[PDB]
């Protein structure tokens, strides 16, 4: 995996090499062992972990429709910013698109995680994140 | 990495750059190897100036450039075909042969192109009191 | 765990100028340090006579004690910039393997295993972070040092030693005399000066000669004491305008007079010599004349023959070697040496002094640039690991750039002052100093 | 400012090792000396303060030392700061001396940047052109009709000649008197 | 006449807000910056990057960054007024979600938004107060 | 969006981490080839549109 | 790498940090195999290594090798370089493309298009295939 | 307090110049009161050449250091006095040196009287015994004859020596003027002693 | 934790004769200021060293 | 006649006017036809009078081959004047100091005498001047505006009326200035503003633009040819008057010519395939840092370094093949003949041998293999023999961060044909900070007597 | 009559440096070291070796087969026919003040 996008810009040499750290998010996805001075690159290149894979585009429309039909999801028109702030509603996003609101974020996230585990309503390769 | 691929040795003669007159770069081009400015710094620190002459003038680009003492501008001198001419002074020309490098000649020609006149003040002649 | 239990009950009260989190981190870092006793088991499981690894480490051939303690008996706490593993993964988390706001030491980079025992996944990950940090710092320091080296070389290269052994650029003087002694860096040896630390009574006992009643030896002892006083004054003053410079009796000199005297004595067949007033007086006179003519090393031998005036700065340059010759060729120290042996000793001293001078076409500027640039990489690594200091941002090339770029006071960081108390009587009380 | 010396963020107490000559003339290294280490530099304020001895104020700031004390104090401070930066495995003192002397030869502390080079060697057009900004330096030299003597390393190098240092510093001339008495002409 | 491999390239996530302290800038009024590379549908459709800058002058500006409107630091309330918003109270509500609430966050945000409203952009000044 | 940015100004939330892989993606050869094809095919569609447009007028 | 958790891989490279196809006849499975070798073909040999000081010829990361180990074919193979794109020179055996199996020395011209392609590499080479395919435009192509 | 140190050390500076006071010394409280009421304090001294040197100590806040007109009037009236002036020393607060108008007044007065030396200095120069500071090497002024002999021996021109500003605190205390040579006895670690000679150049401001 | 032989703990060479001790990085090591090679260079020249 | 040995003691930089170009140039470009047949077209931009790039045709001016001719400048007579790209700023300053109707300055020259000479003009220009009235003439100085679109166009704004200051008007304005004004403003007599407008430009010597192809596509030659063509398009002796209107096509052509000159000199230079003369100098790849400081050299080898416990600290092991490649030049004399005869007889068949013999009477280098039987080694000839054990060689490792990075080692030739590495004692590595982990090193054997002496006596690793 | 200015060529305003006079300091007034520096000894040996390569006539009685050895032994035996000129000053009046040193009467440094 190459990060040459940064290399194109006139980024500081010290800053660029600074990016070659091992980050706390790498484990399980990017090999943490060093390049072993392979010589193909100074080290800007990184290798995927043994079990790491890359997900392909899912069916966002089906999940969006399912969420809209879900009783917990409230459409943006129905909710009011004052209602969101006061009643403690939770914003719901799909691919960064704010589709609606929810009363309890944790319950919705857990329910859709269960649906994913069943593997019928939700595809296994869909990320569900609760902040 | 194999030693046979990494090694390289070159003799006096080989391809030369058209512009600077220096050896072509690298082994792929069958040219010479580079003595960067760090090597020049080290050689200067050791005081090795005859080595610097041998490497950067004889082995690298090296040329006798003729400069008119009267005006300090490059002149025309050819011994085989008799030519002793200065465009500026005409008569009163006093040609002197300085040792230089084709790279420096190209550098001075580039500077002159930009309408920057370069006058070289040749070292004065010195005579015994006699 | 005791520190953590204190944290849960809120007992930790940080001192002035430190937050609770910073004090807790410092306490945890201090608590997790390995003791020296960790080396007891290691030395109990190895036979020094027949252990290759230990023999390599101890003899200095390769390795170090920390390497042995990491290979066997545990790596211990991992430190980056003198700090534990910061929670980068998430708010209050260091890795996916530990809970938010974890309290155990293992969650912040404490390795209880050794390389031989084997490292678990989090321990391996933390070690990987530390090693990659070392590599990245090394690369950054190399790049910065190369940049500063190019700039310094082009800023200093014009300085060349001339026929007066001065340093000048296009005849404009940079130094009146190269190095302030006019010597080559490769022609110096460290020699100890005996009279620096001696007391007045000790100096008199060890150096005053009483065999002959002539006032010449009184003059010699007076010269010794005067030179000692000059050295003491100059170097105390030197230590008074530096943060931590300390007076030292060892100095780098071009000639080791003591070694020459010892070698001549060793090859001397006469061994112990009888008493001869004429020989003693002649030796003293020869030593005095040699000391007087010493500055003529820089000037010709012709001028020495003509006894022309000597510039002041050349006398100052020769002062240190004059002092060393006085100390090491004193009458008490040269009693079993004949006049011929003394003449040979003086000739050898002069020859070595002339051979130790700097040449007349040296590009001293490039030498200085290279010498000052080389240690900068290691300085960058050490300064990066110097972040422990609080309130001063000396990390990186910040301070070398401040020095070389002549940044104004406003742009300076990590500025400091050392202030001494008004009188030498109240400076030994800590409460007054704190007040 | 309610109290204290402006510019001094913090002030801690430190222990100092200092040599001193006692009544007997012996040089003893006193270890129980207490001094104050500050987090900011203000030499003038420290001088004004009565509790602090004003003749032994040490500051790590080269600019403040140059302002308050002078060029020689600035040179000594440059030496000390470079030595501190060097570390344990520092170079010989003469290289630090060279740095400080070059940086302070004009009566003011000049940097090693291109500005310092311009301040120290304004007429060396070729050297400054070699370091950086060839076009701007060339334009300025042409406008000002600068005359550059050929000295140092960069100037002869850019002109194709070899520097006159090292083995070429001193001229060699033939001994006519010796040869005319010892050697014979090829024709003769 | 050769073998070539198009290596996987790492890029920034899309439809997500990236907030960067632009301290690297030299003598720049901007103190923080917010990038939002918006993209509809799949990964092959056109994407537009909106940059939200907060300056030392106190003005929040938005740059569409498309060929059109490129390098234009449009004040945010201008954008709000164009699309239908009429009152400044509603405009501030869209950001704070509540004007009645007295939480310190709300008050500080309202103060910043006032300072951004009143400050006069060198460009768009004539239009600034236009109803 | 503005609200979030303001929260960072107040120091309530820290600035986004660039190195973190939560906000990163790994695009294969498809995306790069698609971009190159976009540029080249746009050029090759501009080239005939002017040529055809000029020809029809004539 | 086996027992990677028992080594600190960065410090291994800390000294080494910063700074045409070979076909090897013989390869063997490592005596201490890892999972990674269930998915890649091992390339190397189980060499008998002695950890000792023998004459100081293996210092500073140097290694002393057995001449017989080299002769027996250990780490021996074929390096392939393709002149697919294509003074005093031989020209005698060029015959257009030279016959296969002919030693090519420095200076001799590999192909003759006077137009010819000289051999610059100092190491001698042997012609493997002189087959000439057809270029993209049907022009004569040399492989 | 700067005023206390200035009062203590200005007379030490006068003594270090081998000068003799022409008026009796006043007490510190009166000195402060004069500085406040009049805005300046005047000290007159006589050199060995019988030239008169006047030192003006200006308060931090005052009409002279704020409006150029009063400073111009004061300087013009002072210089017109029948006393044979060798130098005028004006001690001001540091930011006063950064005010253009005052500096233009000083430059104009210098131009109007080429034969008089007019210098304006900060407080910090005279708030301590400069020569006694440990960090400052020992400076001395060498006569033109010794400098000429040294240059002739060394085959040097005055422009080839290292330059030292005429307003360097040690040089200010010494009293050297531009075109003079100062010998400095440096303490060095490579060699215990060292001697250098520096050429005095124009004073900043 | 170790037993040291009384002869090894100190290195003493007198007039080129190794009276006592062991040679290691301190004496013969590279970069060792004051080592035997430094003294050999000082007394007899770098080539002899 | 002979040219005596000489050295350069100083270099003087100055602004080159059109007079300098006319005097120095050896020809005038008149046609845009690049080539006539194989030989360069006479009167074009590749005229042989300006130098030779190819071996077949020699320099007409000095009768030298591609080597030994430095390039010989040419001229191009511009039908309309063009401003100097490198001094545009200077021109602006002058326009802000001197009256546009007469030559007298509008500023007081005595307010800047105290300032040091270089800064006088800059300070004077910095002063506001719009609306100031000239003392000698009633004309009031207008504002001078620099066009933002380009780096050379100037406008004059007088009471709200804007006009374009064409190069001819600027030249006429500057020609009215007096040398006294130039001197009083800190500039020298050679920096008179009048020469800031060029009627004839210098076509650079062929040597600096050897991209001519006998008869990519991006070169300075293309720019020069385009400039010549567009200049030919301009009407000859075009006269431009203050306030006069110009045909739009003529104005466009003049702007094109000025922009072509500006791009030829200062394109893509701090204020991709854009050739410019002044972009050659800067950067690590530029002329100064890549060609002048540092160089490529012949007679040099590079190889991997390994260890050898049987080599002294001042010896280096050299492969036999490299010894046969690199050579040492020995001048045959009455004392070398006996020692050099075995080298000559061995030739290229045995070791030690030789490669070439430079015969002085013929002044020619002959390869030993092709040497005739009658050929003999004679006094004055130079024999290039192989490197033998005992020779001295410079050994270097990069980066060269210390003065010991380059050392001189005695050559020990390893006659084993299977060894191809530079073998050194391990204890020597401390000089170069090297390890036998794949580190490579350069090695070159001096061949001249002076260099060999210097290497043996001064640069020895001892 | 207003006068226009045409800039003359730079060459016209250029005046070549006037010839200098060699001022040899008297033997007794020399102040430069009487011991050859390593640079000076190396330069002397190199120049003598090159001139030996040009012309083989040598004063040394012993016979050597290399110019370098002949030059080295000439320097050591004090038979080298070259002189060392040390340029001290170049005065503006047009004088080159130099010191002439005889290698045969000078001290020789450690070249090996
Ligand atoms: Mg290595
Ligand atoms: Zn001429
Ligand atoms: Zn020619
Ligand atoms: Zn007018």
Numbering used by the authors:
A (entry chain B): 524 to 654
B (entry chain B): 1113 to 1242
C (entry chain A): 678 to 1112
D (entry chain A): 1258 to 1445
E (entry chain B): 197 to 327
F (entry chain B): 393 to 450
G (entry chain B): 786 to 804, 822 to 888, 910 to 936, 952 to 981
H (entry chain E): 1 to 205
Would you copy out the relevant sentences from the publication that reported this structure?
African Swine Fever Virus is a Nucleo-Cytoplasmic Large DNA Virus that causes an incurable haemorrhagic fever in pigs with a high impact on global food security. ASFV replicates in the cytoplasm of the infected cell and encodes its own transcription machinery that is independent of cellular factors, however, not much is known about how this system works at a molecular level. The ASFV RNAP bears a striking resemblance to RNAPII with bona fide homologues of nine of its twelve subunits. Key differences include the fusion of the ASFV assembly platform subunits RPB3 and RPB11, and an unusual C-terminal domain of the stalk subunit vRPB7 that is related to the eukaryotic mRNA cap 2´-O-methyltransferase 1.
We have solved the cryo-EM structures of the RNAP with the clamp in closed and open conformations at 2.7 and 2.9 Å resolution, respectively. We solved the structure of the ASFV core RNAP in two conformations, i. e. an open and closed state, which refer to the mobile RNAP clamp and the width of the DNA-binding channel. Subsequently, the batches of corresponding particles were isolated and provided two maps at the nominal resolution of 2.73 Å for the closed conformation, and 2.92 Å for the open conformation. However, to achieve better structural information for the protrusion and wall domains, we employed a new refinement method, named 3DFlex refinement, applied after 3D refinement of the closed conformation map. The new refinement produced a higher quality map, improving the local resolution in particular of mobile domains exposed on the surface like vRPB5, vRPB7, whose map quality was comparable to the multibody refinement result, and the protrusion (for comparison see Supplementary Figs. 3a and 4a). The active centre is well resolved in both the closed and the open RNAP conformation maps showing the catalytic magnesium A ion (Mg A) fully coordinated by the aspartate triad D457, D459, and D461 in the conserved NADFDGD motif. The bridge helix (BH) is in the straight conformation, while the trigger loop (TL) is structurally well-defined in both closed and the open ASFV RNAP structures. We identified two additional densities of unknown nature in both maps of the closed and the open RNAP. The first density is located inside the DNA-binding channel, forming a stacking interaction with the side chain of residue Y824 on the bridge helix (BH) and surrounded by several positively charged residues. The second density is located at the foot domain of vRPB1, and also surrounded by positively charged residues.
